[PDB]
């Protein structure tokens, strides 16, 4: 049975959704910090 | 029955690497800006300071001819030469006496040299 | 270019000075003379060069010019049916050009720039090409010689040439990015060539003699060694190898031994027939020839030379055998070029790296996926001379650790002339269990059953033998002299075979299981009838015992009737007996 | 630290060393970047630092390296690995770079992969039984958890797909302890040093099988790779462990799948520096490099975690008095030892228990752990089959027909031994199996011989045949 | 106070400039981070250090400080019952102090300065004391440590602190000079401490094994080694011996071994009883644990610390056992700090004076009058692993030389599982002949008589051993074949021995003068019974060989009854036939 397969390739694009939607609300953030902490 | 898991974290490993890259895509960007800013000679000023006192006794300094000007005055504040290569576009670099140990303080070399360490500090803000 | 002047000459090394800018292992032109040369250690304003040719008669202070490129070799169509020396220069041209003699600084190309190829294209223009990827095809020899993309070169097509006859030097294709692509490129020998991915070896390299290919098989993607003293039958066996073998290119590099075995080669092979394309044997075979006597520092790049025409000839969709007729004499090599450095010896005075320059050299062989999408395979059979028959030396211990396979000769068997003299006690092979899947499809479902039997008498056998020895076979029971008498019967007339007969030379994996069965099948009756108070004596004086004995040269078209009578009469002389 | 101090100014490269000029401020053991004038760049420890010069071994090979374009700059004053959690389903070279197409990993820590020497005080004593499934390591060569039990094998011995089945048959018994944590299976660290496309492929193929690539993290360092990065691999390996290990709990099988090819990287080193060798050019203090990677394995107090190291190596011509087999059975705590005669006999796994040994074995076994004959059983074992191996001996001269009663009684027991507890084929035997089997076997002599069992272990267990044990 | 700076590092060798006045064998603090180190080879300015601490990330130029005195440990009250690095520190406070994991530049003094002792004096003011004299005493967990005076230092008591509780560094007297003494003074390990004389040993070392005690008897003040291959076990017996021996203080050092036998001892030996005080055996047990993984520098450094507590705990008046858990370890690490020094070795590549270093250590040992006019012992049994078992290594040949007992151990004993696996044949003991008459006094008049009777039946089957690998064992007559059978009895029931059975695992001298006397009693009766034409099979199936061979496992305190009771029925079982 495949059925099993699709559900987790479904809940795979589902978290890379998921993660790809939180990182989204802290990509400002990351790179103030990024070019503070690389700035002298 | 495992391979499914195994997509699952492939997918989020390779998630979590593009949002990073793209992040430092981001960050390399607005780093490379930082010539038109008006501060632009005080930070090209502070990173020759930390090259030129990393390397006591440096023989010359090399730099862009347009970052040229901006560190005339501390090149012969410190007496070492100052010299002119288009090649290094937003870094310093200094020769040294002997001419074989070389500092180079490019904004490029500090951030593809800290981004392992800040790494963890992003993910951390990003999700964690 | 990085030019100096020779400041040290000290047998096949040469140190020169002025040579600040010289990149490790370059290609330098030592002397006025132009030797070869390649730089192994750099120092200061100095550098060590390794001199592939004949030293004698330098003078300090002659110019070294470095011409900035590795050891390379040109790969393309023309090195078919030819013979090169160490560092691929076709000893046709040199003797054409020098006479009986093998003069230093001979300068010929290594593919026939005049000789006219037929080309013809499959790309087109504004089409992708990728390192790899075909971009035409070119008749050799029936062969289809696929002119390959350089595995580094990667761009846009913009202009092909038609049709027609060309040089291997006119520019076939160009791309949009001004690269002009020749017939041929250069590789490193260095350098392994890449492969899109490497694949488990499931298909037996069918070598054609009945003990390596039934007790001590190799796929066709392995790897085997085959040590022994001198007279053991390395060389017969890899001659018999190339001959028979079902390998589509066959690559013989004869590294620091006699010149007399390539004459041999040169002149047998014309004359013989491809087991598979039917035409001349030679048009199949690649001689890299770096005789005992020649320059000692041109074994190692014979060896290099040798298996990277290999890998070419795999990248073009071939399976290839590559035999290595003797690694000792290139480990004296390394030996005697590590002396000259002064270098801290290991064991035995080899270099300590040498164990890593036989595993990179026999980890370039096995089946892989080409970067063109075809499929493709070296098999590299290693000889190895350890000194006075001991296979505890440094060079059979480190091959041991590599390779799949271990083909081990016996000095006894060969003084009493049983060959091909493998020691099938201490012989094995990791890739026998990898290929019943091919077997039980190919040549007999039951295949590898009577495989295990007969390594079970032999075994049996062997271990009798000795009680034998000590007592005598007179003090042993009916039913281990019959074990004795068909071990014996094996050894000589299935695990035996002569290489020079015309019919022995080669067998296939048919006559060999008809031979084992027909075996199998006497010692079952034999048995029975032991059981039922017949007596072993009487046994032995079949004839029977006889037609087993010459069935193994009998012809492979003549060899299926000969099999069933055979079997017939195995039944009927002990039924008649009843 | 943020700066990139560079290095021109090559003076010497040969082989696996490069020495660099005016470098006061390259720390020893610091690694550097050499990049050559292609613009390459590859890798470099620093092994000696002068005032002069600084000599620096190099990973990757030589080829291309020039004394007018190479520069050498600093990565790290220490050697230090990024390790994560993330880890545990990814594939490494020898020197830690990913190889499976995956980004890098975002590292929690950068722990120095040279590590520190575990305090014996914080250490605690090993006594988890494991069972492997294989009745010849169960019983008599028990494997207990945080132990350094290497196998030593030959050329064509099967060390590999020993190591292979009991990495996948590896389990503990609670239930036989009295304990109820009913702990997930072990993740598996594997470590190859100069391993073949072959036995790669084999372990690849076997891992997948088994489901145990998701919790395994590998470390791949080929034979065409180069061979100074196998200095680091084990390192890594063992540092990825530790860290598992003791900081989540993780319960870590470590497998070095080939120290010599290690031993062989260390000796080409030594011998580039002119060391003073020991036995074989082997450089003196192979047996300290080998300890600083072998000690790093055990059970620490008040840590749930724990490392168990199955390190295989290749005694060259089957020489147990080889140094490399010699130093490693003086570091580690006893050895698996395959056996080339019994392997011709097509007995798998050919493990031939007299040279064998495990240090270990009495803290695991006995009452309340295993079972409360384990331990004799096991001695009157091996008395047995010593026993066997000299009647064996002396009808080697005296010949077979002129043995008394008892000595044909020891040979068919050793016969038997041989067949059926050493040769178990890739069957899973639990211990109670395993225990069944020796006493079957034990049965074959009289109750009288078995002077190393107890007498109530005898009434206990005695009697049953070989033919009852399976239809 | 020298300073300098740090010119090259390599390994565990450092080099240093600017240091002149610096003394040899003095202790420098290396870098900033001030690791201990210590000076082996003065040049011109320059002086060589090597460092007891890991080097890496150190750089050049780092600050190099002498303290200018030698490698010294201090010495006093708290050395029971805790563990130590070569350096003597604590291992305790280390752990607590940065974790699981031993960091390196832990500074940790070796006695504890917060704890208090109960100071008892018994000298008073105005008393002259000379350098070894008992100052006061200081209880420490049930032994009565005694305050020794330096000895080195002479005057007349000034003042003395009343009874009561003080810590180490309190000055508890002072004299007329000035000076003060503490509880605790500082030695330098590489000196041996001064003793009035040497006394003959005449007190045997009973290590609770029969073997050990019996045939290859140790002296009190005698020394031991037990060389052997890996798996032997060596360090099995060595862990016997410190739990089972007569010694007052057992000191055990773990030079360069496994850190798990260390773990094993701290947590086992808590758990168990003293032999004689009764208290927890830990209480008089001193560990200095230098593991494998530890600094290599540190493993001579560890040695010298342990026979220096061991000399200091027999100034006290205490028989010390020193068991160093291997030699070996010590020997490699002088190697590969001459590898680094670049000198040339002696054969096998260790240094010339390692021979020196070996008698150095072995002649501190002895039976000797304290500097206090009490008497005291230290006993050194030192282990020794030469490489793949070959005994001819210079290690073990410069041990034979200077101890008085070797127990050589066999691979093929310990293969079988049979243990001591004492090699008979190639050990031997020079302090039978001194031992005797206290053997005569407390454990029989007969005892040595019994013995000799015992090495002499060993011999004659070992004698006889040649005709039963020539002929077989039933080849040989009944009277010779009843010679090998006692032999193989006396091999398993007295010889063996479990040490991890719960009464097996210690055996008095009693027990063992039994044993001997029922298996002499057996051997004469059976001797008796074949003359009477009484055949060697049914002598082998009597009872009475089932209560010989569990003999061994009945308890001490039951012991006697069953001695008697199985003479009883030894003589019984041959006189009752008939
Ligand atoms: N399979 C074979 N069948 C028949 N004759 C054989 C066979 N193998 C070896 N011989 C005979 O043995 C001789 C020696 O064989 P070679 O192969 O030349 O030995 P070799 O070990 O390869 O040579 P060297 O000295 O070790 S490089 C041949 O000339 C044959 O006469
Ligand atoms: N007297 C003994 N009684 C029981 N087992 C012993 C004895 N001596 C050694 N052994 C066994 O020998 C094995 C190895 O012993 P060990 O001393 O640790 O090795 P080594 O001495 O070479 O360091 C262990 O399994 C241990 O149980
Ligand atoms: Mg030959
Ligand atoms: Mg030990």
């Known amino acids: 049975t495949e059925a099993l397969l699709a559900r987790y390739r479904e809940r795979a694009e589902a978290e890379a959704k998921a993660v790809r939607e939180k990182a989204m609300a802290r990509l400002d953030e990351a790179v103030a910090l990024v070019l503070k902490e690389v700035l002298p | 029955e495992s391979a499914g898991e195994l997509l699952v974290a492939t997918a989020r490993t390779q998630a979590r690497g593009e949002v990073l890259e793209e992040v430092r895509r981001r960050v390399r960007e607005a780093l490379e800006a930082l010539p038109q800013k008006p501060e632009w000679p005080e930070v090209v000023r502070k990173l020759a300071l930390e090259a030129l006192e990393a390397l006591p006794g440096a023989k010359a300094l090399v730099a862009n001819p347009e970052d040229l000007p901006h560190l005339e005055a501390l090149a012969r504040e410190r007496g070492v030469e100052l010299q002119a290569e288009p090649a290094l576009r937003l870094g310093v670099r200094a020769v040294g006496a002997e001419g074989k140990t070389q500092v180079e303080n490019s904004l490029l070399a500090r951030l593809d040299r800290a981004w392992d360490a800040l790494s963890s500090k992003v993910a951390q803000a990003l999700w964690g | 270019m990085i030019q100096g002047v020779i400041q040290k000459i000290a047998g096949p090394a040469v140190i020169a000075k002025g040579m600040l800018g010289a990149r490790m292992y370059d290609i330098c032109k030592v002397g006025e003379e132009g030797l070869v040369g390649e730089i192994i250690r750099l120092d200061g304003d100095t550098a060590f060069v390794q001199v592939y040719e004949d030293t004698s008669g330098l003078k300090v202070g002659e110019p070294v010019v470095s011409t900035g490129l590795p050891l390379a070799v040109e790969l393309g169509p023309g090195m078919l049916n030819g013979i090169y020396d160490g560092i691929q220069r076709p000893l046709e041209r040199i003797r054409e050009k020098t006479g009986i003699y093998i003069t230093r600084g001979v300068v010929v190309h290594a593919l026939d720039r005049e000789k006219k190829w037929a080309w013809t294209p499959m790309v087109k223009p504004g089409d992708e090409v990728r390192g790899g990827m075909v971009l035409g095809t070119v008749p050799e020899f029936g062969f289809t010689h696929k002119i390959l993309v350089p595995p580094d070169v990667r761009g846009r097509v913009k202009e092909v040439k038609p049709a027609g006859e060309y040089t291997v030097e006119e520019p076939v294709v160009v791309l949009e990015d001004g690269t002009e692509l020749k017939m041929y490129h250069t590789w490193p020998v260095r350098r392994a060539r890449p492969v899109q991915r490497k694949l488990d070896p499931n298909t037996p390299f069918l070598t054609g003699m009945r003990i390596l290919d039934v007790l001590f098989p190799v796929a066709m993607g392995g790897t085997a060694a085959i040590p022994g003293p001198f007279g053991a039958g390395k060389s017969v066996t890899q001659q018999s190898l190339a001959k028979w073998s079902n390998a589509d290119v066959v690559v013989y590099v004869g590294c620091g031994e006699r010149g007399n075995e390539m004459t041999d080669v040169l002149v047998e092979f014309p004359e013989l027939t491809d087991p598979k394309t039917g035409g001349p044997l030679m048009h199949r075979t690649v001689l890299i020839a770096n005789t005992s006597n020649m320059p000692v520092a041109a074994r190692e790049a014979s060896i290099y030379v040798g298996v990277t025409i290999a890998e070419y000839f795999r990248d073009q969709g071939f399976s290839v055998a590559l035999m290595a007729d003797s690694t000792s004499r290139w480990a004296e090599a390394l030996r005697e070029i590590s002396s000259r450095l002064e270098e801290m010896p290991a064991e035995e005075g080899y270099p300590p790296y040498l164990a890593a320059r036989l595993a990179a050299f026999y980890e370039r062989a096995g089946k892989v996926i080409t970067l063109g999408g075809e499929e493709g395979a070296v098999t590299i059979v290693g000889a190895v001379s350890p000194p006075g028959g001991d296979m505890s030396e440094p060079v059979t211990q480190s091959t041991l650790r590599i390779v799949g396979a271990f083909w081990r000769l016996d000095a006894s068997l060969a003084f009493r002339r049983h060959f091909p003299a493998i020691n099938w006690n201490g012989s094995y092979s990791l890739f026998t269990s990898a290929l019943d899947p091919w077997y039980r499809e190919n040549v007999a479902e039951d295949y590898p059953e009577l495989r295990d039997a007969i390594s079970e008498l032999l075994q049996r056998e062997a271990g009798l033998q000795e009680i034998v020895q000590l007592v005598g076979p007179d003090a042993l029971q009916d039913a281990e002299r019959l074990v004795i008498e068909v071990g014996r019967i094996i050894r000589e007339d299935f695990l035996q075979q002569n290489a020079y007969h015309e019919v022995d030379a080669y067998c296939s994996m048919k006559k060999a299981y008809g031979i084992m069965k027909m075996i199998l099948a006497f010692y079952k009756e034999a048995e029975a009838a032991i059981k039922r108070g017949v007596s072993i004596d009487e046994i032995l004086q079949l004839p029977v015992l006889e037609r087993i004995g010459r069935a193994r040269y009998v012809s492979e078209e003549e060899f299926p009737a000969y099999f069933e009578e055979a079997m017939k009469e195995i039944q009927g002389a002990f039924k008649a007996l009843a | ?471």
């Open chain 4, 1 to 471: 630290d943020l700066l990139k101090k560079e290095y021109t100014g090559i003076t010497y490269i040969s082989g696996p060393l490069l020495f660099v000029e005016n470098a006061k401020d390259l720390a020893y053991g610091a690694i550097v970047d050499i990049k050559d004038g292609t613009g390459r760049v590859r890798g470099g420890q620093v092994i000696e630092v002068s005032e002069e010069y600084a000599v620096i071994q190099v990973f990757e090979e030589t080829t291309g390296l020039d004394l007018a374009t190479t520069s050498v700059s600093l990565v790290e004053d220490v050697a230090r690995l990024g390790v994560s959690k993330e880890m545990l389903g990814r594939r490494f070279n020898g020197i830690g770079k990913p190889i499976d197409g995956l980004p890098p990993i975002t590292p929690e820590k950068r722990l120095p992969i040279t590590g520190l020497p575990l305090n014996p005080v914080a250490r605690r004593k090993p006594e988890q039984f494991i069972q492997t499934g294989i009745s010849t390591i169960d019983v008599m060569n028990t494997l207990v958890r945080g132990q350094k039990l290497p196998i030593f094998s030959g050329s064509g011995l099967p060390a590999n797909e020993i190591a292979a089945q009991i990495a996948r048959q590896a389990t503990v018994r609670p239930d036989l302890s009295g304990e109820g944590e009913k702990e997930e299976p072990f993740a598996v660290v594997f470590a190859a040093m100069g391993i073949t496309q072959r036995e790669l492929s084999y372990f690849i193929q076997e891992f997948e099988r088994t489901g145990a690539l998701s919790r395994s993290v590998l470390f791949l360092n080929k034979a065409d790779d180069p061979t100074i990065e196998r200095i680091l691999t084990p390192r890594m390996a063992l540092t990825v462990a530790e860290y598992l290990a003791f900081e989540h709990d993780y319960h870590v099988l470590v497998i070095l799948t080939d120290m010599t090819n290690y031993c062989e990287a260390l000796r080409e080193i030594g011998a580039a520096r002119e060391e003073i060798p020991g036995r074989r050019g082997y450089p003196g203090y192979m047996y300290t490099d080998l300890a600083t990677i072998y000690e790093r394995a055990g059970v620490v107090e008040g840590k749930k975690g724990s490392v168990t190291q199955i390190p295989i190596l290749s005694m060259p011509d089957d020489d147990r008095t080889h140094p490399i087999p010699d130093l490693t059975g003086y570091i580690t705590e006893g050895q698996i030892q395959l056996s080339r005669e019994l392997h011709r006999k097509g007995i798998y796994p050919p493990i031939d228990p007299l040279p064998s040994l495990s240090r270990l074995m009495n803290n695991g076994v006995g009452k309340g752990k295993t079972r409360e004959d384990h331990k004799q059983v096991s001695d009157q074992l091996y008395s047995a089959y010593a026993n066997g191996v000299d009647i064996r001996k002396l009808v080697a001269i005296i010949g077979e027909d002129a043995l008394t009663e008892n000595d044909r009684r020891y040979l068919q027991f050793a016969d038997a031994f041989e067949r059926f507890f050493i040769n178990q084929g890739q069957q899973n035997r639990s211990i109670e199996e395993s225990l069944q089997i020796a006493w079957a076997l034990l049965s074959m002599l009289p109750q009288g011989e078995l002077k190393r069992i107890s007498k109530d272990h005898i009434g206990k267990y005695y009697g049953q045949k070989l033919e009852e044990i399976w239809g």
